[PDB]
């Protein structure tokens, strides 16, 4: 009780707080999915620009 | 007291949502429900039928 | 410690007063643990974060 | 550990501002949600007697 700071039970436990890990997994999947597309676009642009000028 | 507590909870908040919350907020709402039931504002503060 | 408390024995006012600031230590010990896991609203923390940097309402 | 894990998981997916920094998007969204005024810039550096001891003052310019 003294260490928790709560007289009833722990806090930040529960599916409302546990689900955030799975939300992070999905968010990271989406973020990498979009970042790969953006990196491919930028790489195509750079490979065009350099070999046209350089 | 548990019966009245969970009656109040399932009427006001819901048992599934209550299960989703933390043990601390669970206890907070349980204590509020226990107070609501002990008071019995609708029975004229009387635990009789 | 025996020397110090043998001198505390000889005091008159400090030995009955300087301890009254000690409950405040336990007050902090308890409130800190209360705050380590306090549940808060995300909206208010994002709208009114306490002593966060780059808040224009503060000036910076 | 529970608190900081939840806080980190919310900071990653941009549901919560980063540690020590006031984020604009989250604050504006929270203001729209709570129906409160948006965080403006109420300061006035050009007020009379604010940057007089400033060696490198700021110049007034109507953008």
Termini distance of chain D?
A: 48 Å
Distance separating the two termini of chain C: 50 Å
Number of helical regions of chain D: 2
Shape of chain C: elongated
Shape of chain D: elongated
- Give the SSE string of chain D: HH
What is the number of helical segments of chain C per DSSP (H or I, 4+ residues)?
Answer: 3
Multimeric organization: part of a larger assembly
Which structural class best describes the helix and strand composition of chain C?
mainly alpha
Strand elements of chain D, count: 0
What is the share of helical residues of chain D?
Answer: 25-40%
Please name the two chains that share the biggest interface, counting residues whose Cβ lies under 8 Å from a Cβ on the partner chain. C-D, 16 and 23 residues
Strand content of chain D: under 5%
Sketch the major β-sheet of chain D: none
* Content-based structural category of chain D: mainly alpha
In short:
The structure is cut from a larger assembly and holds chains A (54 residues), B (49 residues), C (60 residues) and D (63 residues). By secondary structure, chain A is an all-alpha fold. Chain A has one helix spanning 15-53.
Q: Which helices and strands occur, and which strands form pairs?
A:
The structure is cut from a larger assembly and holds chains A (54 residues), B (49 residues), C (60 residues) and D (63 residues).
Chain A: H1 15-53
Chain B: H1 2-12, H2 15-20, H3 23-39
Helix pairs in contact in B: 1-3
Chain D: H1 2-12, H2 24-34
PDB class: membrane protein
Keywords: mitochondria, ATP synthase, membrane protein
Entry title: Cryo-EM structure of Euglena gracilis mitochondrial ATP synthase, membrane region
Task: Give a written overview of the molecule.
The structure is cut from a larger assembly and holds chains A (54 residues), B (49 residues), C (60 residues) and D (63 residues). Chain A is built from one helix and no strands. Chain A is rod-shaped, with a radius of gyration of 23 Å. In chain A, 72% of the residues lie in helices and 0% in strands. With 54 residues, chain A is mainly α. Chain C has 60 residues and is mainly α. In chain D, 35% of the residues lie in helices and 0% in strands. The longest helix of chain D has 11 residues, at 2-12. The radius of gyration of chain D is 18 Å and the shape is elongated.
């Amino acid at each position: 009780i003294y260490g928790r700071g709560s007289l009833y039970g722990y806090r930040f436990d529960g599916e409302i707080h546990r689900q955030e890990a799975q939300n992070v997994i999905l968010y990271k999947e989406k973020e990498a999915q979009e970042m790969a597309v953006v990196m491919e676009k930028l790489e195509k642009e750079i490979q065009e620009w350099l070999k046209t000028m350089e | 007291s548990r019966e009245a507590i969970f009656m109040v909870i399932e009427e006001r908040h819901g048992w599934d949502n209550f299960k989703k919350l933390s043990s601390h907020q669970q206890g907070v709402i349980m204590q509020e429900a226990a107070q609501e039931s002990l008071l019995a504002r609708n029975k004229g503060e009387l635990h009789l039928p | 410690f025996y020397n110090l408390y043998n001198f505390v024995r000889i005091g008159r006012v400090s030995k009955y007063v300087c301890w009254l600031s000690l409950p405040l230590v336990f007050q902090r010990m308890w409130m800190k643990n209360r705050a380590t896991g306090m549940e808060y609203d995300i909206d208010l923390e994002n709208y009114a974060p306490f002593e966060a940097k780059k808040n224009p309402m503060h000036g910076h | 550990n529970l608190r900081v894990e939840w806080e980190k998981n919310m900071e990653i997916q941009k549901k919560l501002h980063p540690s020590g920094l006031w984020s604009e998007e989250q604050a504006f969204a929270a203001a729209e949600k709570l129906g409160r005024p948006k965080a403006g810039h109420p300061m006035r550096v050009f007020e009379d007697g604010y940057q007089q001891f400033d060696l490198k003052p700021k110049l007034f310019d109507p953008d």
